[PDB]
Every structure is written in structure tokens, then in C-alpha cells.
């Protein structure tokens, strides 16, 4: 990482819009779930857009793809889910600076299948 010190100058400092938190999943339509995220600090540079991504845990866990984005004003976007599909949802913030890192990682939303129980394959993840 960089390393400096001293330097009198009334200059600001940015670093893309920090990642969101408290990520949650709530809906009430039918075939369209809404992803509620909370954009933390903007770091001088205000949010302009919010990209999202997900990873097919039911297929290839760790493969994030392009889901959808929105304006830097809203904080709720609809996600298209399918039956027998597991994956996470990561929100991203993009401003004049650039695109920040993806949100931590919301809960594992598993659609309805031919069997109850959230995740079919449980395991000691993160211990």
C-alpha cells in the first residue's frame, strides 16, 4: 500500500462508495423479490448507481455474474429468482470515482423446490 505524510492542502479524499450492509431480502409481489440494501458512506463522492450480482451456489458457488443495477437514489431492486436455484446477492455502489467492492453477502435465499428446509445441503460454513 501507499505511504505518505505531511502536505498542507485543503484537498478532499475519495475512494468509491463504501459497500452496503444490513442486506436483506423482502418482497410481496409474486414472481419478483425485492433486495433492500443500505449504502454506507459515499466518501465525498455520492452514489450514482447500484450494481448487483449473485453466485449460483446450487451450481458453482463463487461465480458472481451480472444481475442488475439501479440509480444512486433508490435502494430497492427486484430480483428474478427461479425454482430449484440457490445463490447469494451482492450489492455494489458506483460513483464519479468508481465501483466499490461487493456487499458482504446477504443470506442464502433458496427458492421453493421438491423439498422443505432452507438449504438442502447444510455444512459448517465459516467457523
Swiss-Prot record:
Glycans are attached at residue 86. It is found in: Cell membrane; Cell projection, Axon; Secreted. Detected in all the examined tissues. In the brain it was detected in the amygdala, caudate nucleus, corpus callosum, hippocampus, hypothalamus, substantia nigra, subthalamic nucleus and thalamus. Residues 19-114 form the Fibronectin type-III domain. Constituent of a NFASC/NRCAM/ankyrin-G complex. Detected in a complex with CNTN1 and PTPRB. Interacts with GLDN/gliomedin. Interacts with MYOC. It is linked to Neurodevelopmental disorder with neuromuscular and skeletal abnormalities: An autosomal recessive disorder characterized by developmental delay apparent from infancy or early childhood, intellectual disability, hypotonia, peripheral neuropathy, and/or spasticity. Disease severity is highly variable. Most affected individuals have skeletal defects and dysmorphic facial features. Some may have ocular or auditory problems, behavioral abnormalities, and non-specific findings on brain imaging. Cell adhesion protein that is required for normal responses to cell-cell contacts in brain and in the peripheral nervous system. Plays a role in neurite outgrowth in response to contactin binding. Plays a role in mediating cell-cell contacts between Schwann cells and axons. Plays a role in the formation and maintenance of the nodes of Ranvier on myelinated axons. Nodes of Ranvier contain clustered sodium channels that are crucial for the saltatory propagation of action potentials along myelinated axons. During development, nodes of Ranvier are formed by the fusion of two heminodes. Belongs to the immunoglobulin superfamily. L1/neurofascin/NgCAM family. This is Neuronal cell adhesion molecule. The chain holds residues 638 to 751 of 1304 of the full protein.
Amino acid at each position: 500500500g501507499s505511504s505518505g505524510s505531511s502536505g498542507p492542502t485543503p484537498a478532499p479524499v475519495y475512494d468509491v462508495p463504501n459497500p452496503p450492509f444490513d442486506l436483506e431480502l423482502t418482497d410481496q409481489l409474486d414472481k419478483s423479490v425485492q433486495l433492500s440494501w443500505t449504502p454506507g458512506d459515499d466518501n465525498n463522492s455520492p452514489i450514482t448507481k447500484f450494481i448487483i450480482e449473485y453466485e449460483d451456489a446450487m451450481h458453482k458457488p463463487g461465480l458472481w455474474h451480472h444481475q442488475t443495477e439501479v440509480s444512486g437514489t433508490q435502494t430497492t431492486a427486484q430480483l428474478n429468482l427461479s425454482p430449484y436455484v440457490n445463490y447469494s446477492f451482492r450489492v455494489m455502489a458506483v460513483n464519479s470515482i468508481g465501483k466499490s467492492l461487493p456487499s458482504e453477502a446477504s443470506e442464502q435465499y433458496l427458492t421453493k423446490a421438491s423439498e422443505p428446509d432452507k438449504n438442502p445441503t447444510s455444512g459448517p460454513s465459516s467457523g
